Design an enzyme around this catalytic site. Structure first.
Site, PDB file in Angstrom:
ATOM      1  CG  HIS A  40      32.559  44.277  32.307  1.00  0.00           C
ATOM      2  ND1 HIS A  40      31.307  43.714  32.419  1.00  0.00           N
ATOM      3  CD2 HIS A  40      33.277  43.800  33.354  1.00  0.00           C
ATOM      4  CE1 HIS A  40      31.263  42.939  33.489  1.00  0.00           C
ATOM      5  NE2 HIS A  40      32.447  42.976  34.075  1.00  0.00           N
ATOM      6  CG  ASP A  84      28.874  44.372  29.865  1.00  0.00           C
ATOM      7  OD1 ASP A  84      29.914  44.288  29.180  1.00  0.00           O
ATOM      8  OD2 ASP A  84      28.826  44.069  31.072  1.00  0.00           O
ATOM      9  N   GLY A 175      34.065  38.410  39.227  1.00  0.00           N
ATOM     10  CA  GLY A 175      34.617  37.169  38.723  1.00  0.00           C
ATOM     11  C   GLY A 175      33.586  36.318  38.006  1.00  0.00           C
ATOM     12  CB  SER A 177      31.866  39.893  34.970  1.00  0.00           C
ATOM     13  OG  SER A 177      31.351  40.779  35.946  1.00  0.00           O
ATOM     14  N   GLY A 178      30.333  38.054  32.680  1.00  0.00           N
ATOM     15  CA  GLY A 178      30.440  37.404  31.385  1.00  0.00           C
ATOM     16  C   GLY A 178      29.754  36.056  31.392  1.00  0.00           C
TER      17      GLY A 178
END
Ligand SMILES: [Ca+2]
Length: 223
Positions: A40, A84, A175, A177-178
């Site tokens: 995402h 994801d 923020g 995320s990942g």
């Protein structure tokens, strides 16, 4: 990170910031030329920033390398966030040292009750906004799938796992995320989603990395 603590400069050597003119997502360095992040977080024009602490100040341990290619997981479903995960190849290899190092992929899935280290430059408030400039850390245990599915009925797939506190107050956030979820020195998760941040009975949901080890290894080997 909400309710966390300041990691300290370069204490999380595999943490990277994805920058497209500004920080938009985190990621983990798995080898000198590959980064794993969340699907995402996909976008064109990604520059990978390693050796970062204060993302707004050049402190001297940074390495800014542009991505040569991005590979979103074949079965990524943006509506459910199932699968994801994304791989990013750097145009040139990074110089590895004690401050910039890669994280090992797991050989087995981590069990519920294992304590992990989550990190990122995401929002630090459950209500309102406040983005830090230095790296934030949080130690949280992996929750049982039962409590995870009870918290999010009909949304948790086999490729997801919950980590955090049902009481709330501590959690990853926008923020982050990942970013990485490291347990026992292995990358076990990727910051994916959650309902708000640090809310009661709404823990963070992370991509279960152990289910993707073959895909990661095979992709790296042929690209
Ligand atoms: Ca910096």
């Amino acid at each position: 990170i909400v309710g966390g603590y300041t990691c300290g400069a370069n204490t999380v050597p595999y943490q990277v910031s994805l920058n497209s003119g500004y920080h938009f997502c985190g990621g983990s360095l798995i080898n000198s030329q590959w980064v794993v992040s969340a699907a995402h977080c996909y976008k064109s024009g990604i520059q990978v920033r390693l050796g970062e602490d204060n993302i707004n100040v050049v402190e001297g341990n940074e390495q800014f390398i542009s991505a040569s290619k991005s590979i979103v997981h074949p079965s990524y479903n943006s509506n459910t966030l199932n699968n994801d995960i994304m791989l990013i190849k750097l145009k040139s290899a990074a110089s590895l040292n004690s401050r910039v190092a890669s994280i090992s992929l797991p050989t087995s899935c981590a069990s519920a009750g294992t304590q992990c280290l989550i990190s990122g430059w995401g929002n630090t408030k459950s209500s309102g906004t406040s983005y830090p400039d230095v790296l934030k850390c949080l130690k949280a245990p992996i929750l049982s799938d039962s409590s995870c599915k009870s918290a999010y009925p009909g949304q948790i797939t086999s490729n997801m796992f919950c980590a955090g506190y049902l009481e709330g107050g501590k959690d990853s956030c926008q923020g982050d995320s990942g970013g990485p979820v490291v347990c026992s020195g292995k990358l076990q998760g990727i910051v994916s989603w959650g309902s708000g941040c640090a809310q009661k009975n709404k823990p963070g949901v992370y991509t279960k990395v152990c289910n993707y080890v073959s895909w990661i290894k095979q992709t790296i080997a042929s690209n």
